[PDB]
């Protein structure tokens with residue numbers, strides 16, 4: 001019992017060496033190459049573990065139920081049970097054994113072939129057969145293909161079949177012109193280091209119709225991941241990439257000859273879409289004689305995933321942005337089904353997963369407008385659209401009277417002289433301003449005064465009833481919305497700015513569509529829902545039904561009144577309640593000052609659809625309201 005404590009330490013740090021991937025240090029703990037001692041030499045153990053554990057991708061060796069006893073003068077036999085993770089799953093209830101040798105003060109392990117796998121004898125071998133699982137598709141709310149694995153048409157060139165001299169140079173340009181490609185890229189692809197005279201070197205992928213084939217234009221049909229919408233759903237869906245040797249080290253259950261999701265839903269749902277690798281891990285002997293099977297299970301394909309996205313609304317919402325920086329969120333506000341999650345500018349997913357020239361990948365990483373960003377998940381300042389929330393709070397606590405008319409003179413205003421030179425500004429010079437007039441002309445001075453009148457304490461009481469600080473249940477990485485940096489404004493100026501959607505507010509378009517969903521459910525907040533089978537979670541009594549019955553009729557006038565900020569939408573001739581708004585951004589990249597246009601709109605008759613569009617760093621005379629008539633028409637007669 002005095003040396004058994006050091007004997008259990010020997011088995012403890014031996015399994016730790018195997019579990020740490022260091023087989024050399026694990027071999028140094030064995031005895032000497034003899035009949036009853038260790039059965040192999042030093043490097044003979046290193047090569048035995050590395051070839052077997054490396055082939056099956058063995059990682060995570062845990063042991064339990066140790067029992068170290070005695071038998072002879074130095075033969076203290078040990079036995080335990082272990083578990084490990086391989087390419088085909090987890091090995092459980094592995095009964096191990098062996099003996100020890102405690103000569104002097106160094107207790108070693110009499111190594112035996114049963115220490116690699118339980119039922120391995122003298123010179124036994126291990127074999128692994130695996131069949132990769134097909135990746136499941138991603139479908140929309142109507143079963144349309146958003147991310148399937150289909151057949152593609154390739155285009156490559158063989159350097160020998162290009163001619164026999166100067167004819168190759170002319171055809172290198174004839175192939176570049178017949179398929180719209182760079183002539184310098186064809187002669188560069190055929191002159192790489194790995195290129196051989198008769199090797200089929202690929203080029204680009206034919207999108208559909210195959211043009212005339214010049215002097216050697218082989219079209220080898222290949223299979224790969226295909227995204228039918230392309231850039232329209234690039235940020236949402238994502239892209240898959242080839243699996244690296246360092247990826248298998250983290251999760252050994254991945255097929256090294258397969259694809260892994262790198263961003264978006266392809267990554268957030270990688271476990272459900274890749275399936276499980278099938279095959280058999282058996283122990284053989286001599287000439288592949290199947291002795292004992294360790295693991296063997298059938299191949300399971302990936303589960304298809306149905307979203308709440310409308311493929312037609314996703315493409316229309318993206319195309320309406322015209323390639324400018326922005327995003328659009330369209331939902332069914334009574335259930336939360338996100339019908340479209342567009343972001344612009346965007347990248348090409350089919351180009352990323354099917355091989356992209358590194359010059360073009362630098363264009364996406366160095367693009368100032370950042371096409372990789374999912375702008376529907378990026379927190380912004382909500383802008384003038386946030387006055388709906390501030391007004392609804394003011395009506396609930398009785399601070400704002402819908403019929404009380406404030407008298408505002410000029411375009412600038414400040415509470416006292418303690419504000420220095422800062423003044424709340426408004427665009428229109430209306431003298432008599434009530435709640436109806438302030439929401440039509442988008443008056444900041446009215447909301448600023450009614451916010452200071454409301455008080456900081458009473459303001460947050462209504463704000464805390466929303467989703468500020470909450471993390472929504474969506475497979476989209478985002479930060480929770482915040483009222484301010486700290487839990488206290490500690491500034492009258494900051495309180496007024498937060499009244500009309502400025503200050504230290506950060507709300508992403510998905511969270512905005514959730515907070516604004518109360519105006520379509522009579523004060524009940526409906527959480528957004530991306531997976532089609534998810535339940536409809538809601539949160540009632542956020543604002544009173546009285547404030548909804550007061551603001552919603554006013555939001556109709558933002559469209560119908562001749563001086564409304566969203567009057568251009570009255571041309572649609574459909575029932576609409578909207579609320580526009582810009583937002584000042586003082587980014588230090590330039591001394592100008594970028595501003596972001598916003599737009600919120602929904603149908604007040606049936607509450608069938610709700611839309612939140614925005615334009616980041618908008619161009620002059622451009623607005624989200626201008627480029628919203630297209631999908632507002634679609635959402636009107638398709639989601640009533």
Ligand SMILES: *C(=O)[C@@H](NC(=O)Cc1ccccc1)[C@@H]1N[C@@H](C(=O)O)C(C)(C)S1
Nearest residue numbers: 383384427442444565580581582583584
């Ligand atoms: C709401 O965000 C308001 N805008 C501002 O406070 C900043 C601003 C930016 C550019 C010009 C003027 C003022 C008002 N809402 C928007 C809108 O509803 O589009 C206005 C441009 C009417 S100012």
